[PDB]
Amino acid sequence: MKLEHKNIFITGSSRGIGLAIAHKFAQAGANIVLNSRGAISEELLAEFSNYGIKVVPISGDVSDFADAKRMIDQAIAELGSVDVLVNNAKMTEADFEKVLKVNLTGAFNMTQSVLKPMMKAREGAIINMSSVVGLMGNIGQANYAASKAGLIGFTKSVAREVASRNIRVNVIAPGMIESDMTAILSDKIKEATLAQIPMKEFGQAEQVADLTVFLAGQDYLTGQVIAIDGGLSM
Amino acid sequence: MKLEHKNIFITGSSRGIGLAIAHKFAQAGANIVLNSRGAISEELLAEFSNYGIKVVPISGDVSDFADAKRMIDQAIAELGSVDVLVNNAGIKMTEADFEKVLKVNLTGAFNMTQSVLKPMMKAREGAIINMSSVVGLMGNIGQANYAASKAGLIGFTKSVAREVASRNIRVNVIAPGMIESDMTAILSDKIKEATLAQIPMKEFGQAEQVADLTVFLAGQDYLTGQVIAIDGGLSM
Amino acid sequence: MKLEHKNIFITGSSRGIGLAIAHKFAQAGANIVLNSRGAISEELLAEFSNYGIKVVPISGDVSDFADAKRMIDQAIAELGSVDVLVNNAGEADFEKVLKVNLTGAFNMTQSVLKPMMKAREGAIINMSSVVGGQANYAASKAGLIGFTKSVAREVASRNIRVNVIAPGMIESDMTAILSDKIKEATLAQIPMKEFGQAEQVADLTVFLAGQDYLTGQVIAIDGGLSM
Amino acid sequence: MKLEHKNIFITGSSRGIGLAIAHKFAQAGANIVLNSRGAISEELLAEFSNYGIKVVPISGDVSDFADAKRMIDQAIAELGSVDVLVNNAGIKMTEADFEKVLKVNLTGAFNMTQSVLKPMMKAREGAIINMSSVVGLMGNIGQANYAASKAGLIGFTKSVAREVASRNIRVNVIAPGMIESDMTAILSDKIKEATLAQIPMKEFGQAEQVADLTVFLAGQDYLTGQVIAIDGGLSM
């Protein structure tokens, strides 16, 4: 009931967890922006034409400051507003570092872009999300932890500045999620991976979606970091 | 859906936020244990009659280890299991009554947790939610004692969560802020505008919002060891 | 020597970990209180008489608040003061011992704080019990950790350091005499593939007692067991 | 003595905390590698000639993996082995390259750790001590970058500790707080008093406390994967 007819911008929502988040927001009656760095296909656009909600495809590069502002502006012109922004996010360590920086920059830019309209409406929610945890070497673990800390400090800073304007700003930290590849991995490497999760199991994408939609509709909750990772980041 | 027919032991649930928590869980279809240091009235039980669940009163002293064990067993007997424990214990007063209420929250959280962990670890399932005490009007000495007790409840919760994760038990802390109470409508505007000025979001919480978070956490698998303030940014 | 003539009250110091801690403190030149539920044997006192320190025996029940205060008062009466408190924690029997140990740490900590707070200094070192399941083991170790953080917060502004040591599996008589296939399966569970030694716990306890500006820490000495 | 004749490689030990650490290791009878980006002055080597230990100057760039590898090989060839690696860091001017010294120090821990792990794993013995930088007075962007690089150093340390525990190698991080230094008298009474009031023990730390903790960890067996804050309770 709290989310019906609200307008949700979900970055990276053509695949994976972002798509699960978008299905869950749609099941709650909210209007949906589907967003990808690539194109949104008519396939995907049709999965969402059974909920009786407005669905809008908006592609672009969140990591380009002006293009992030363009994407927020398009959503406002097509839906009327953005009530909720969900900032959902290689092989060498150097390329892995670059990917983390791109996703962090994208979260920064989209957050900066919606602040002005949300602050006018005295209304809105921003949910920043660290990336799903994969297998990483020592240096990848370090780079992962550094960029996650960066996202948390930024998000807490923004939470403090916009509280008096009734904008709620929170971070969700997923852990290791099952995928179709999990079935394919060796029982050896699963066992050494599970060993590092206190709850000794992998997460599911739908758990992240449930938490995301719950936070979106939950007044009076701001500045929080909520890990949903079976204890991984304890 | 995910809480329907689950069994919820809610301590200190005869009034206030505890009682609001009990109502949300009943609205989710969970059976509930209403608990108080003293007797539970027939008119309080009457409030839950249209929910189509089981409601059990168990009164006792959560801060007495023997009676904490007694109350958990009695809840298992009458309901079948304890799937969720919500520790919300403790109820003008001076600083000494304030320390005592803080120590009751901790002791009761400790004892009720230790008791319920015996069946939950054998069943390999369960959720425990520790509630810090609602934040009221506090001076110098008061905030110091509050901060130390909260550090204790958080440290306790994170440590327990570490210890029991391998047996599939989730343990989290909720930290309510300044919550609107039946009292609040009769406070004076000077004291109200002066405490609102301390809250980043410039408003008071609702008991129902604390209840919503409590019920959500209880059903949310794979979330453990978290501290979630619901306080309009007071603790930021 | 940061510890010569400091006054160390060491609960449960007649055997095992507590005895090893008492020896390390005595080796650093500190005065020590040897404590146990029963009487301190004459032998034990004599095993400490050539360190050149004051050795004070004080028997009693830590899990009884009035006796806890009697014991601290007695130690303050016999030594200068109590500069360092070490709260050492060695079926339904298992539950009663954990309860005595956790209550003991609470009672002795409360009794020793007023003198330390007035002095602007002190150190309290809590000990969780060694590993090797129970609800009670989990809750009690967590209880001690939560109490330690609460007290560290409470007393930091008076320059009093409060820390917990969490030992892992320690070799003992009990370890040494069991199946060599159970030890194999047991050591396999420890990332450093070996058992700890009481003397390692003792070195850590002495270091924290003497180390300024370190408080509120939970330090596992467990071969990575809890990483 | 547990450190007598052990071979200690201390990065950034020509001045500040790193130098203090070197002196504490020499007082424990350990052989020392003094290291800096520039060349080690003969006057600094003279401070150590009196200890009856062996003292070896090795300069280079820790943030260059090839030169990191070579520095380690040089130390093995002049001392026999590296038993303990201390990845030391630390610092008036800009925000532009506060980030630069953080990243250089951080990647330095990366390369030196990666380089010494081969001979320690073969030797089946060893210790690695990483150290976050001293907490100083920082703008908001400073604190943001400080928190990120510290989080990165901790994740690196925990990951390596897991990797090498089975080959008897101990890996830990020290997290200093605010160290009283030359920037302490200059600061105004409003500034010290307000800063001191944010530290729970209400006082500034000393470099010697960090050096003492470093020496203790180097010699303490069976202790690995720990993050040890010596910061007056700042991060409790």
Author numbering:
A (entry chain A): 1 to 89, 99 to 243
B (entry chain B), D (entry chain D): 1 to 91, 99 to 243
C (entry chain C): 1 to 90, 102 to 143, 149 to 243
Sentences from the paper on this structure:
One critical component of FAS II system is 3-oxoacyl-[acyl-carrier-protein] reductase (FabG), which plays a vital role in the elongation process necessary for the production of both saturated and unsaturated fatty acids, utilizing NADPH to catalyze the initial reduction step, facilitating the conversion of 3-oxoacyl-ACP to 3-hydroxyacyl-ACP intermediates. The strains carrying plasmids producing either functional FabGs or the yeast OAR1 exhibited the same growth as the wild-type strains. These demonstrated that SpFabG has the capability to complement both E. coli and yeast in vivo, thereby functioning as 3-oxoacyl-[acyl-carrier-protein] reductase FabG. When SpFabG amino acid sequence was investigated through multiple sequence alignment, there is a conserved NADPH binding site along with the Ser-Tyr-Lys active triad responsible for substrate catalyzation.
We have determined the crystal structure of SpFabG at 2 Å resolution using AlphaFold predicted monomer as template for molecular replacement, shows casing its similarity to the overall fold of the E. coli FabG. In the asymmetric unit of the crystal form, there is a single tetramer. Despite the slight differences in the flexible region among the monomers, this analysis primarily focuses on the structure of the most stable monomer, chain A. Overall, the protein conforms to a Rossmann fold, with its core comprising a twisted, parallel β sheet consisting of seven β strands flanked on both sides by a total of eight α helices. The active-site residues (Ser140, Tyr153, and Lys157) are clustered near the loop connecting β5 and α5. The conformation observed in the crystal structure is considered to be inactive conformation, with the Ser140-containing β5-α5 loop occupying the pocket where the nicotinamide part of the ligand should be. In three out of the four monomers in the asymmetric unit, this loop is stabilized by a crystal contact, and the electron density clearly reveals both the conformation of the loop and the active triad. It is noteworthy that the hydrophobic side chain of Tyr229 inserts into a hydrophobic pocket on the neighboring side, resembling a key inserting a lock. The interface B, locates between helices α4, α5 and their respective counterparts in the neighboring monomer (α4′, α5′), constitutes a four-helix bundle.
